[PDB]
PDB file of C-alpha atoms in Angstrom:
ATOM      1  CA  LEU A  56     -97.626  99.570 -13.113  1.00 20.58           C
ATOM      2  CA  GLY A  57     -97.839 102.737 -10.938  1.00 20.46           C
ATOM      3  CA  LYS A  58     -94.631 104.907 -11.158  1.00 15.58           C
ATOM      4  CA  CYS A  59     -93.376 102.628 -14.039  1.00 13.40           C
ATOM      5  CA  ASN A  60     -94.502 101.942 -17.564  1.00 10.49           C
ATOM      6  CA  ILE A  61     -94.464  98.771 -19.800  1.00 10.20           C
ATOM      7  CA  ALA A  62     -90.741  99.141 -20.778  1.00  9.81           C
ATOM      8  CA  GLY A  63     -89.383  99.469 -17.237  1.00 11.32           C
ATOM      9  CA  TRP A  64     -91.325  96.344 -16.158  1.00 15.46           C
ATOM     10  CA  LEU A  65     -90.324  94.182 -19.206  1.00 15.85           C
ATOM     11  CA  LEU A  66     -86.556  95.215 -19.177  1.00 18.29           C
ATOM     12  CA  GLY A  67     -86.550  94.870 -15.284  1.00 17.49           C
ATOM     13  CA  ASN A  68     -85.546  98.473 -14.385  1.00 18.95           C
ATOM     14  CA  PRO A  69     -84.349  98.654 -10.726  1.00 21.53           C
ATOM     15  CA  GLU A  70     -87.170 101.116  -9.846  1.00 20.78           C
ATOM     16  CA  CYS A  71     -89.660  98.569 -11.174  1.00 21.28           C
ATOM     17  CA  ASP A  72     -88.580  95.526  -9.037  1.00 19.67           C
ATOM     18  CA  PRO A  73     -92.013  95.419  -7.264  1.00 20.86           C
ATOM     19  CA  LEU A  74     -93.633  94.517 -10.654  1.00 16.91           C
ATOM     20  CA  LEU A  75     -91.217  91.642 -11.479  1.00 18.56           C
ATOM     21  CA  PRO A  76     -93.047  88.967  -9.469  1.00 20.13           C
ATOM     22  CA  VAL A  77     -96.484  89.803 -11.104  1.00 20.19           C
ATOM     23  CA  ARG A  78     -97.541  86.593 -13.009  1.00 20.00           C
ATOM     24  CA  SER A  79    -101.178  87.278 -14.073  1.00 21.06           C
ATOM     25  CA  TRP A  80    -103.779  90.061 -14.574  1.00 21.69           C
ATOM     26  CA  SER A  81    -107.248  90.760 -15.996  1.00 20.52           C
ATOM     27  CA  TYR A  82    -106.110  94.158 -17.530  1.00 18.68           C
ATOM     28  CA  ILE A  83    -102.950  96.341 -17.319  1.00 21.01           C
ATOM     29  CA  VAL A  84    -103.082  99.862 -15.769  1.00 19.57           C
ATOM     30  CA  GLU A  85    -100.620 102.842 -16.042  1.00 17.06           C
ATOM     31  CA  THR A  86    -100.882 106.282 -14.378  1.00 12.26           C
ATOM     32  CA  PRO A  87    -100.139 109.817 -15.660  1.00 12.75           C
ATOM     33  CA  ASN A  88     -96.702 109.578 -13.801  1.00 11.55           C
ATOM     34  CA  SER A  89     -95.507 106.274 -15.453  1.00  9.93           C
ATOM     35  CA  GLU A  90     -92.004 107.682 -16.041  1.00  7.75           C
ATOM     36  CA  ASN A  91     -89.768 104.740 -14.849  1.00  5.27           C
ATOM     37  CA  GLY A  92     -89.243 102.941 -18.240  1.00  5.26           C
ATOM     38  CA  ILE A  93     -85.946 102.738 -20.046  1.00  5.29           C
ATOM     39  CA  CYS A  94     -83.155 103.813 -17.530  1.00  5.82           C
ATOM     40  CA  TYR A  95     -80.348 104.210 -20.107  1.00  5.38           C
ATOM     41  CA  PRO A  96     -80.948 106.245 -23.333  1.00  4.95           C
ATOM     42  CA  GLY A  97     -81.438 104.843 -26.806  1.00  7.08           C
ATOM     43  CA  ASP A  98     -84.643 103.504 -28.393  1.00  4.75           C
ATOM     44  CA  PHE A  99     -87.041 100.535 -27.942  1.00  5.10           C
ATOM     45  CA  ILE A 100     -87.450  98.882 -31.376  1.00  8.46           C
ATOM     46  CA  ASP A 101     -91.134  97.943 -32.173  1.00  8.13           C
ATOM     47  CA  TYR A 102     -92.408  99.232 -28.633  1.00  7.22           C
ATOM     48  CA  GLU A 103     -95.782 100.035 -30.065  1.00  4.66           C
ATOM     49  CA  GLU A 104     -96.187  96.457 -31.335  1.00  4.40           C
ATOM     50  CA  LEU A 105     -94.856  94.977 -27.938  1.00  2.00           C
ATOM     51  CA  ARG A 106     -97.509  96.670 -25.785  1.00  2.00           C
ATOM     52  CA  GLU A 107    -100.074  95.420 -28.493  1.00  2.00           C
ATOM     53  CA  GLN A 108     -98.847  91.885 -28.101  1.00  2.00           C
ATOM     54  CA  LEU A 109     -99.135  92.314 -24.245  1.00  2.00           C
TER      55      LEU A 109
ATOM     56  CA  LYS B 165     -68.108 117.926 -36.447  1.00  2.00           C
ATOM     57  CA  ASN B 166     -70.673 120.751 -36.241  1.00  2.59           C
ATOM     58  CA  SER B 167     -73.357 121.153 -33.370  1.00  2.00           C
ATOM     59  CA  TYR B 168     -76.384 123.377 -32.822  1.00  2.00           C
ATOM     60  CA  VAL B 169     -78.399 123.679 -29.578  1.00  2.00           C
ATOM     61  CA  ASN B 170     -82.106 124.554 -30.029  1.00  2.00           C
ATOM     62  CA  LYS B 171     -82.543 127.806 -28.093  1.00  2.00           C
ATOM     63  CA  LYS B 172     -85.799 128.829 -30.016  1.00  2.00           C
ATOM     64  CA  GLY B 173     -88.202 127.293 -27.475  1.00  2.00           C
ATOM     65  CA  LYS B 174     -89.890 125.607 -30.543  1.00  2.00           C
ATOM     66  CA  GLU B 175     -89.410 122.407 -32.621  1.00  2.00           C
ATOM     67  CA  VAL B 176     -86.434 123.127 -35.022  1.00  2.00           C
ATOM     68  CA  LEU B 177     -87.006 121.103 -38.233  1.00  2.00           C
ATOM     69  CA  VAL B 178     -83.457 120.355 -39.682  1.00  2.00           C
ATOM     70  CA  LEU B 179     -83.040 118.875 -43.204  1.00  2.00           C
ATOM     71  CA  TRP B 180     -79.894 117.269 -44.846  1.00  2.00           C
ATOM     72  CA  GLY B 181     -79.059 115.180 -47.891  1.00  2.00           C
ATOM     73  CA  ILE B 182     -76.459 112.385 -48.143  1.00  2.00           C
ATOM     74  CA  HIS B 183     -74.493 111.954 -51.353  1.00  2.00           C
ATOM     75  CA  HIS B 184     -74.251 108.575 -53.303  1.00  2.00           C
ATOM     76  CA  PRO B 185     -71.742 108.498 -56.271  1.00  2.00           C
ATOM     77  CA  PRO B 186     -72.246 106.381 -59.511  1.00  2.00           C
ATOM     78  CA  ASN B 187     -68.491 105.498 -59.254  1.00  2.00           C
ATOM     79  CA  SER B 188     -65.512 105.338 -56.732  1.00  2.00           C
ATOM     80  CA  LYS B 189     -63.576 107.960 -58.783  1.00  2.00           C
ATOM     81  CA  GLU B 190     -66.103 110.752 -57.864  1.00  2.00           C
ATOM     82  CA  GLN B 191     -65.936 109.561 -54.176  1.00  2.00           C
ATOM     83  CA  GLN B 192     -62.175 110.429 -54.130  1.00  2.00           C
ATOM     84  CA  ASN B 193     -62.615 113.565 -56.329  1.00  2.00           C
ATOM     85  CA  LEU B 194     -65.224 115.291 -54.102  1.00  2.00           C
ATOM     86  CA  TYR B 195     -64.692 113.756 -50.584  1.00  2.00           C
ATOM     87  CA  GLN B 196     -61.013 112.244 -50.319  1.00  2.00           C
ATOM     88  CA  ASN B 197     -62.233 109.247 -48.268  1.00  2.00           C
ATOM     89  CA  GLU B 198     -63.518 106.129 -50.086  1.00  2.00           C
ATOM     90  CA  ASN B 199     -65.173 104.761 -46.975  1.00  2.00           C
ATOM     91  CA  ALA B 200     -66.845 108.048 -46.171  1.00  2.00           C
ATOM     92  CA  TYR B 201     -69.778 108.275 -43.720  1.00  2.00           C
ATOM     93  CA  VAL B 202     -72.145 110.704 -41.940  1.00  2.00           C
ATOM     94  CA  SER B 203     -73.726 110.413 -38.440  1.00  2.00           C
ATOM     95  CA  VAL B 204     -76.487 112.833 -37.287  1.00  2.00           C
ATOM     96  CA  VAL B 205     -77.647 112.275 -33.732  1.00  2.00           C
ATOM     97  CA  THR B 206     -79.651 114.105 -30.945  1.00  2.00           C
ATOM     98  CA  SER B 207     -80.886 113.178 -27.344  1.00  2.00           C
ATOM     99  CA  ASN B 208     -83.472 110.708 -28.793  1.00  2.00           C
ATOM    100  CA  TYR B 209     -82.125 110.325 -32.331  1.00  2.00           C
ATOM    101  CA  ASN B 210     -79.154 108.076 -33.457  1.00  2.00           C
ATOM    102  CA  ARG B 211     -78.297 107.308 -37.112  1.00  2.00           C
ATOM    103  CA  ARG B 212     -75.295 106.511 -39.256  1.00  2.00           C
ATOM    104  CA  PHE B 213     -75.383 106.969 -43.054  1.00  2.00           C
ATOM    105  CA  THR B 214     -72.914 105.327 -45.466  1.00  2.00           C
ATOM    106  CA  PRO B 215     -72.560 106.170 -49.276  1.00  2.00           C
ATOM    107  CA  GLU B 216     -73.867 103.246 -51.447  1.00  2.00           C
ATOM    108  CA  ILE B 217     -71.590 103.432 -54.561  1.00  2.00           C
ATOM    109  CA  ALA B 218     -72.894 101.606 -57.707  1.00  2.00           C
TER     110      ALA B 218
END
């Protein structure tokens, strides 16, 4: 996921467009600087369960 | 409306109640507005509260 997190990839944040064609994986990786998530403020309802599904 | 900026450099724990009458007469007596409400919000908090009269 690199510079992005789970929420920026799943919502399709413009800064996470390199992650949108990724079909398959063996495991998912973030970094300590995975800040490009939600790009307009609010909340993500049941986020903790969504990354548990994924 | 009333607003406070946290300038303590520390996590400011704020508490508030919300009134719920037993009857619509007390709603008018103490608050003027029958369809009263409260909304308390921050940068990452968003809630609206509405009096349940019964």
